[PDB]
Amino acid sequence: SISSRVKSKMIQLGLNQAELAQKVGTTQQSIEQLENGKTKRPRFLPELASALGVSVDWLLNGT
């Protein structure tokens, strides 16, 4: 699921939830919630896209 896609990229990159949430500028809770499969449109999607240097298209769709 989407949070996996996000995470596994960060992991390889070296980043984790804290660094992620910071760089995104979201709440730490929102990262867990992302990994709770809770929301397709999280309140930082474009911000996440910049955070992993991916597109919004890819984040939503995803290969």
Q: Are residues 19 and 26 in contact, defined by beta-carbon separation less than 8 angstroms?
A: no
Q: How many domains does the chain have?
A: 1
CA 45, CA 49: separation in Å to the nearest integer? Answer: 6
CA 61, CA 63: separation in Å to the nearest integer? Answer: 6
Which residue from 12, 44, 8 is spatially nearest to 28, judged by alpha carbons? 44
Looking up residue 33, the CATH number of its domain turns out to be 1.10.260.40
Q: Are residues 58 and 30 in contact, defined by beta-carbon separation less than 8 angstroms?
A: no
Torsional sign, CA 27, 42, 44, 16 = positive
Which technique? NMR
Q: Are residues 3 and 35 in contact, defined by beta-carbon separation less than 8 angstroms?
A: yes
Q: Domain range spanning residue 23?
A: 1-63
